[PDB]
Structure 1
Amino acid sequence: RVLDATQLYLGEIGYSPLLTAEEEVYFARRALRGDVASRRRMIESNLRLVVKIARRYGNRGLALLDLIEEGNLGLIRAVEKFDPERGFRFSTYATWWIRQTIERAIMNQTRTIRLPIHIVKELNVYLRTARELSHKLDHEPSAEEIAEQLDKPVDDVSRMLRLNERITSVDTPLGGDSEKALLDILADEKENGPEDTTQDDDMKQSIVKWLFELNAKQREVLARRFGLLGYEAATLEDVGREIGLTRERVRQIQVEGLRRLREILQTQGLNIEALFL
């Protein structure tokens, strides 16, 4: 039969009766009282308005259905905050709420990286201004030309235009040819190669061998303090407390062990110096 989401929804809304002014007032008095039924009937009677408005705001923001639901949410706010006693029509009041809710929704949801309302609205004034400039200059305006118009910092304008830079899909295949995407080219830069991984092995293992060249005391002090052969980078007090009370003696043995390593380096450092790239 008819399997379209949209068509089904629009058919259902069609089968609810439109209200007159006096009817809306009667219903709405009871709706503020909390009639439940009254609220439901006013909502359902005025769904068609929502769709007329969502029709306009759609275009490229979001799916029509998505706009319709957010619009409905605005209409509900309007039914809750309607004043029957004031002579103004309901449709007039609702229109404001529906447009408001739809716009706010499309300011949030549309952007993959959620942009706060203040930033979005700022950016929009930059845009509208750019449009006026472009009309009269014949040319699309520079960042500094827009900034001169607003009497504001160029850095501000630039940062905002950077935020407007919209995303590219990693899966989109490149060159009008369904050959291969961005993913196919894009590396993991954090993951170094087997070269870098093997260099760390070599490094760490050379340091073991070099630590054993030193005194048993120096090597153990270095190991525990650096957190190298130990678990935790034990502070001066911790290492001293496990061995020799004198916290100051840990510093002494440590610095002594570093200087013996410098000797090994001046002698055999011909390997160590090449670890500098």
Structure 2
Amino acid sequence: NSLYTAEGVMDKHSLWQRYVPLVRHEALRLQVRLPASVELDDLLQAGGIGLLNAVERYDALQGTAFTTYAVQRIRGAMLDELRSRDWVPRSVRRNAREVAQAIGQLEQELGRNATETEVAERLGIDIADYRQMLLDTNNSQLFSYDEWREEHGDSIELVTDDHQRENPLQQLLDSNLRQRVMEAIETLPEREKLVLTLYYQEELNLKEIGAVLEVGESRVSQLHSQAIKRLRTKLGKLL
């Protein structure tokens, strides 16, 4: 690209070009981790763009190196894109790195493992703190179609369970009971049949009628109760 100035573009871009190898080699140990670590090309694109941003705003009177002004934005960009891929918060991972340091450090202190009260004391915050963190951090993503072990008898897509299923007779008898509500209340005062119909039938408004009559719904309460007492006059399981 370019600027309004031209020699401040060609010097700009010559510098840009010259320390692409820096982008490389500093990246070239930020390897084995998450599979874009395998890619490395994302890294290069990112590095170039962060470079331009640093470049745009080099501060020269400070007398720092421009490589040293660069490294800041370089790293920050790299970390940004990794932070983009992960979808879990940050202080999470602070705590995770911290337990890692501490637990290794103190397992060296002791020379053996797994005496969690040591975690409690060393991280003198609370037990429930790390106890919850253990959930929060250490439990990660898995995939759906992986084979079920002793070659390909079935997958994980066979062995699945659900709770929100359909069931045919509950809606059936629900409608039976709806018409039984009608069967009870068609004999009863003009409004209450209607309030309970149009509230329970087509899923409309209740006190919308309390505003229409303007009786305070004392009588509404009473008649609601009596209709209950009348539909404790039938027998139906699904209890």
TM-score computed with the length of structure 1 as normaliser: 0.69
Change (3 A) 1:180 1:220: farther
Counterpart of 1:173 in structure 2: which amino acid?
E
The equivalent position to 2:185 in structure 1, one of 208, 214, 219, is 214
Counterpart of 1:169 in structure 2: which amino acid?
F
The equivalent position to 2:229 in structure 1, one of 235, 240, 262, is 262
| Contact 1:53–1:98 under 8 Å retained in 2 | no
Q: Does residue 67 of structure 2 align to residue 91 of structure 1?
A: yes
Alignment match, 1:200? 171
Counterpart of 1:166 in structure 2: which amino acid?
S
Counterpart CA distance in 2 for 1:172 and 1:210 is 51
> What is the CA-CA distance between 1:98 and the residue it aligns to?
1.9
Q: Does residue 119 of structure 2 align to residue 150 of structure 1?
A: no
Structure 1 gaps, min length 5:
1-29
Change (3 A) 1:189 1:224: same
Alignment match, 1:74? 50
CA RMSD of aligned residues (A): 3.3
Q: Does residue 35 of structure 2 align to residue 56 of structure 1?
A: no
Alignment match, 1:180? 154
Change (3 A) 1:128 1:218: farther
Change (3 A) 1:259 1:77: same
Change (3 A) 1:41 1:166: same
> What is the CA-CA distance between 1:49 and the residue it aligns to?
0.7
Counterpart of 2:146 in structure 1: which amino acid?
T
Alignment match, 2:215? 247
Deviations 1:10-64 (A, max 9, x none): xxxxxxxxxxxxxxxxxxxx99999233322211221111111111112213231
Alignment match, 1:25? none
SS of alignment partner, residue 78 of structure 2: helix
Change (3 A) 1:136 1:76: farther
Counterpart CA distance in 1 for 2:186 and 2:119 is 70
Counterpart CA distance in 2 for 1:55 and 1:98 is 13
Alignment match, 1:109? 84
More helix by share: 1
SS of alignment partner, residue 140 of structure 2: coil
| Contact 1:147–1:154 under 8 Å retained in 2 | yes
Alignment match, 1:22? none
Counterpart of 2:192 in structure 1: which amino acid?
V
Change (3 A) 1:174 1:166: same
> What is the CA-CA distance between 1:186 and the residue it aligns to?
1.6
> What is the CA-CA distance between 1:184 and the residue it aligns to?
2.1
Counterpart CA distance in 1 for 2:4 and 2:102 is 44
> What is the CA-CA distance between 1:257 and the residue it aligns to?
5.1
Counterpart of 2:152 in structure 1: which amino acid?
S
Counterpart CA distance in 2 for 1:217 and 1:115 is 59
Structure 2 gaps, min length 5:
none
The equivalent position to 1:171 in structure 2, one of 145, 150, 154, is 145
